[PDB]
Structure formats: C-alpha cells, structure tokens
C-alpha cells in the first residue's frame, strides 16, 4: 500500500501519523530525524599557505663580469649588481675597487609548515542530503541513514521508505568556498593562475604535495648596501596572513537557517529548511483487521489543563469504554495540536491521558483514537516565559481569535 506524507525537516523533533482503511485497524507510523546532513559535491582547486622567500647565496666575482643565469623557480628574480665591494668577517672580499660583480637571485616557495597549516580552496557544485532517521511502523522499528534523493530506499522489514527530494533545494555554500582550521568560508578566491599579490591565493598549489607552484608576490630586488653581502628584496606581505587578519566569521556563525558547519566531509547539518516528502510502501501483510485490535466505544474528552506553549503544555483526559483491554494508537488529523505520545493502554472502561502542544488560543480538535474519534474542545491560557530554549513542537495556524 502506497502512502505519502510530508515530514518537516527539523532535527530532534518527532513526527507521527496513522494509516487506516475501512476494514483495517490503525497502523501507527513514527519518524524522528536525529541529524539531517547537507553534503555538497566538492572538488579541490588548490591549497595556499604562507610563503617563504628562498634566495641563492650571492655569487661574487672580483673585477669580472657575470651573467643572469636563468633557472625556472616560482616568481624568480635575478639581477647582476655591478660596482660592489663586499666585506666579510675577515675583511674586504675583493681587491679591485670597481668592476666587481654580485649576481643575486630570489624566489618564492611553500612555507615549511604548509604541510599542516594551509587553506584549501574548493568549488562546491551540487547538494546531497542524507539524514539519520528513526522509523517505526506498528512496533517494527529501525534506525538507519536514508539518502534523501527520492531514489535510494531503505527496505527493512518489508516496508519501503523513500525520502523524496528536499522540497526547497538550497545550500549555505556558494559555488566557491575555502576551508581553514576547521572552518568553512565563502570567498571568491582567484582562479588557478590568476592569483594577485598581497591577497588570498598569492601562492597556490594544485595539491599539498604537488610539484608545481605558481607564485605572484611582486618580488623585486634592490641593490645591496656597500660593504655588505646579502640579497635585498621587497615583497608584498603574505596574502594568506592578510586573509587571516581580515576575514568575516565562518559559515558556522553566519549561515542561514541555523545550519551547523563541519569540515570532514565539508557539510552543513541541522538546517531547519523546507520539508522531506516521505513516501512509505507498506506491505499488505502488515495491516491488521479492525476486529482484532481494541475497539473503542462511547468516548468523551476534556482538556483538564491547557498551556499554549512551545512544549507539550496541554493535557487532556479521554474517558473510554473499550471492548477489550490492550494498547492502541492516538492522533490528531489536523495541524491544530501535536501529540507527545503515539499510543496508549486501555483497561475496559476508564480514563487515559494525552499530552499535546497547541497553537489555538481557543483549541478544538478531533482526537482520533482506536477506531474512533472524539471532539476535544476547550479554552487555553498563555505560557509563563517569554523566551524558551527549544524549538516549536506545534504547527502554527492562523486562528488565534477570541
């Protein structure tokens, strides 16, 4: 039997329903998503880190000419400064006053700490939603991880569960993101091969172990001081450091819909966004006839207490006269009231207690119970505290009138 019902995509809050037919007893169904995960399809564009400016030892020729011998290292600068007269701890290096030459060259390379202190620049394409759910059908219970795509089923005990596509496809990650120190940032980093100096991406590598290294650090050499041996260089300050100094708070403190953000895998969890269109294919063999189950006759309902509140502040007693003692389900076919409990136990004729949370100030709802239903009605009072530390349990509704 094919049944389908939208389930609000809230983490920690439960959801209940009853599936029934003209000659088959109510079969309860309960769902509880303990963690809804939003993994995006992601690939690595590069990794960046602090640079370090390596530099070959100056090659000094005493009154002889030199040449800018080229090598091919990242962001290389090579220059042949003439008219030098260097000094060491032992005195003047050369005897010719003029015509001495010093060839000096400098280059960029990855910091020694880049293997463990680096930022990963990624592109995030599309979303994949998977949720850890607790599903019960007529006391057949399962705890699983369902891939929310409408395709992948979870088929334990013969009932086939399919969690349709997340109704409002949405991600907190833009197309192009960055990971650093276990925090995910939305940042339009330069494409590989366009990194500009003094900003994020000044040095880049396709992988942490990649041989290639593009560097654009605005490296330019200056002539050394007379009587000193060294390689002067003025360079744009490390763009990665500047990004660290100047960056907005991570998505874990700015993401919409209250999403939590985690980094392995890159993902967002507990996004209170949209709803999951669950579809349940219940086998014909799991249904039970109305005759077998406890049948209720001549029930009455009364709200012995009502506190219009986020939690289950509403209490109602049902006086029952059952045909045979046992257990059976209880529900409200309406968004007015959401029940804490799924089923109750009955002993011939007596009373039972139902907990619920409500939106209506003047509540009235049909409590469906054990192959019957009773019209519960009453007046309800406001709650105590202005602010509470948990999310809503009761479906909001327009009617809150006198």
34 or 254: CB nearest ligand NAG? 34
11 or 119: CB nearest ligand NAG? 11
By CB under 6 A, name the one of 34, 207, 291, 397 that touches ligand NAG. 34
- For residue 381, what are its two tokens? 């009072």
Q: How far is the CB of 136 from ligand NAG (least distance, A)?
A: 8
Q: Is 302 in the site for ligand NAG (CB under 6 A)?
A: no
By CB under 6 A, name the one of 143, 169, 228, 298 that touches ligand NAG. 143
Q: How far is the CB of 19 from ligand NAG (least distance, A)?
A: 19
Here the contacts of 226-230 (C-beta below 8 Å, separation 24 or greater) are: 226/84, 226/85, 227/85, 227/86, 227/87, 228/86, 228/87, 229/58, 229/60, 229/86, 229/87, 229/88, 229/93, 229/102, 230/58
Q: How far is the CB of 182 from ligand NAG (least distance, A)?
A: 26
Q: Is 134 in the site for ligand NAG (CB under 6 A)?
A: yes
Residues whose CB falls within 8 Å of the CB of residue 22, separated by 6 or more in sequence, listed in order: none
Q: In the chain, what are the helix, strand and coil shares in percent, each to the nearest 5?
A: 5, 45, 45
Q: How far apart are CA 371 and CA 365, in angstroms?
A: 16
Is 307:313 a contact under the CB 8 Å cutoff?
yes
37 or 110: CB nearest ligand NAG? 37
The number of residues in the chain equals 402
Sign of the torsion angle spanned by Cα atoms 226, 228, 229, 232 = negative
Q: How far is the CB of 133 from ligand NAG (least distance, A)?
A: 8
Q: How far apart are CA 75 and CA 211, in angstroms?
A: 15
136 or 310: CB nearest ligand NAG? 136
Q: How far apart are CA 143 and CA 129, in angstroms?
A: 17
92 or 142: CB nearest ligand NAG? 142
Site residues for ligand NAG, 369-398, by CB under 6 A, read: none
- Report how many residues bind ligand NAG under the rule CB under 6 A: 4
80 or 154: CB nearest ligand NAG? 154
Q: How far is the CB of 46 from ligand NAG (least distance, A)?
A: 40
Q: Where are the beta strands (DSSP E) in 83-118?
A: 87-88, 91-92, 101-110
32 or 349: CB nearest ligand NAG? 32
142 or 290: CB nearest ligand NAG? 142
Q: Is 35 in the site for ligand NAG (CB under 6 A)?
A: no
The backbone torsions φ and ψ at residue 251, rounded to the nearest 5 degrees and listed phi first, read: -65, -20
Site residues for ligand NAG, 94-133, by CB under 6 A, read: none
β-pair partners for 30? 16, 136
34 or 168: CB nearest ligand NAG? 34
Number of other CB atoms surrounding residue 291 within 10 Å: 11
The backbone torsions φ and ψ at residue 214, rounded to the nearest 5 degrees and listed phi first, read: -75, 135
Is 59:102 a contact under the CB 8 Å cutoff?
yes
Q: How far is the CB of 342 from ligand NAG (least distance, A)?
A: 11
Is 106:74 a contact under the CB 8 Å cutoff?
no
134 or 323: CB nearest ligand NAG? 134
The separation between CA 390 and the C-alpha centre of its own chain, rounded to angstroms, equals 20
136 or 263: CB nearest ligand NAG? 136
Q: How far apart are CA 177 and CA 120, in angstroms?
A: 9
Q: Is 351 in the site for ligand NAG (CB under 6 A)?
A: no
Number of other CB atoms surrounding residue 320 within 10 Å: 24
By CB under 6 A, name the one of 3, 5, 8, 32 that touches ligand NAG. 32
Q: How far is the CB of 293 from ligand NAG (least distance, A)?
A: 24
DSSP state for residue 329 in the 8-state scheme: E
Q: How far is the CB of 270 from ligand NAG (least distance, A)?
A: 14
Q: How far is the CB of 247 from ligand NAG (least distance, A)?
A: 37
Residues that bind ligand NAG (CB under 6 A): 32, 34, 134, 143
């Amino acid at each position: 039997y094919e049944h389908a019902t939208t389930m609000p995509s809230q983490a920690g809050i439960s959801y209940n329903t009853i599936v029934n037919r003209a000659g088959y007893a109510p079969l309860p169904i309960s769902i509880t998503p303990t963690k809804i995960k939003l993994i995006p399809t992601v690939n690595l564009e590069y990794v960046t880190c602090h640079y370090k400016t390596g530099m070959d030892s100056p090659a000094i020729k005493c009154c002889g000419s030199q040449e800018c011998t080229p090598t091919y290292r990242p962001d290389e600068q090579c220059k042949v400064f003439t008219g030098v007269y260097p000094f060491m701890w032992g005195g003047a290096y050369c005897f010719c006053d003029t015509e001495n030459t010093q060839v000096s060259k400098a280059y960029v390379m990855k910091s020694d700490d880049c293997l463990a202190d680096h930022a990963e620049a990624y592109k995030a394409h599309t979303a994949s939603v998977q949720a850890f759910l607790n599903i019960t059908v007529g006391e057949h219970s399962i705890v699983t991880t369902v891939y929310v795509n409408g395709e992948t089923p979870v088929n334990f005990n013969g009932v086939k569960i399919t969690a349709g596509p997340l109704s409002t496809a949405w991600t907190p990650f833009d197309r192009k993101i960055v990971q650093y120190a276990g925090e995910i940032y939305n940042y339009d980093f330069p494409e590989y091969g366009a990194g500009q100096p003094g900003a994020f991406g000044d040095i880049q590598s396709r992988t942490v172990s990649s041989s290639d290294l593009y560097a654009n650090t605005n490296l330019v050499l200056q002539r050394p001081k007379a009587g000193a041996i060294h390689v002067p260089y003025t360079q744009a300050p490390s763009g990665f450091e500047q990004w660290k100094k100047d960056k907005a708070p991570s998505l874990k403190f700015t993401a919409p819909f209250g999403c939590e953000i985690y980094t392995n895998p890159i993902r967002a969890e507990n996004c209170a966004v949209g709803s999951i269109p669950l579809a349940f294919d219940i086998p014909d063999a799991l249904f039970t006839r109305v005759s077998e189950t406890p049948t209720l006759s001549a029930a009455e309902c009364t709200l012995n207490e009502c506190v219009y509140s986020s939690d289950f502040g509403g209490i109602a007693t049902v006086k029952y006269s059952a045909s045979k003692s046992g257990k059976c389900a209880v529900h409200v076919p309406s968004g007015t009231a959401t029940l804490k409990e799924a089923a109750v136990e009955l002993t011939e004729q007596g009373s039972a207690t139902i907990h619920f949370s409500t939106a209506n100030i003047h509540p009235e709802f049909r409590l469906q119970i054990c192959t019957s239903y009773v019209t519960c009605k009453g007046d309800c009072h406001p709650p105590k505290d202005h602010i509470v530390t948990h999310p809503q349990y009761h479906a909001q509704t327009f009617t809150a009138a006198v």
